[PDB]
Amino acid sequence: SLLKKLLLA
């Protein structure tokens, strides 16, 4: 999931 990576940044 690309969105999860932007939230976990």
Add this chain to the structure above:
Amino acid sequence: ESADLRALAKHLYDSYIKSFPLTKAKARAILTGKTTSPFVIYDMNSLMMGEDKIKFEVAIRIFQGCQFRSVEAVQEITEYAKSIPGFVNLDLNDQVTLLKYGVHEIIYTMLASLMNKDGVLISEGQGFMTREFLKSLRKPFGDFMEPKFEFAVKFNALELDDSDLAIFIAVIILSGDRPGLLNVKPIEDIQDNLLQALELQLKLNHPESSQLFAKLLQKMTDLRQIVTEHVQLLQVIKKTETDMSLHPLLQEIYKDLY
């Protein structure tokens, strides 16, 4: 309670400035010419010539340019979302759902800040693409931008400020109505507090607009309709021009959306 809601309004505005490089305050100053000019794009010649200023067939070049801007807008909104108090402490799966349904509604909300009735600013203000040029594109490309201009003209008449928009976009993503939400009660607790700060902010910043809060909430459903029409227009691109393909970030947004 009053001094706490105004601290939340000041908290969202400062996080707003740090998340979006082109604010409404700067954008309206460029559009009115009250500053110290963007390259006007009105046809294929000015587009093929102004491509050195665009941060990135004629219709395909506008398609690719929007996709590039859209990817960047999602990342800036996600950064703003992580600064909303309580949002980052929510479960990670709901954070995705909240951003999956709220990004485009915020994109179209902030797309109005850069719009007038003639065109829209592009490339952080360095360019200006006219509505007449975006409407003369080959179909279905020519009907993508007109619904956004019609909404922006009505939305800008509210004369909201960047401090007002910061709370409003926060209210948008903190909506407990999104499908797939696991824990709705903490999300609604954050939105109800966001709505109180929004209501208080509109009474302080706009003592003349008596029912601005009510009028603002009524545009909040117009954004969901634009998203629907935009989705059903993107599916035509997937079917008509079998050459185009969406960015992996935008593909995950629309994957199983509504």
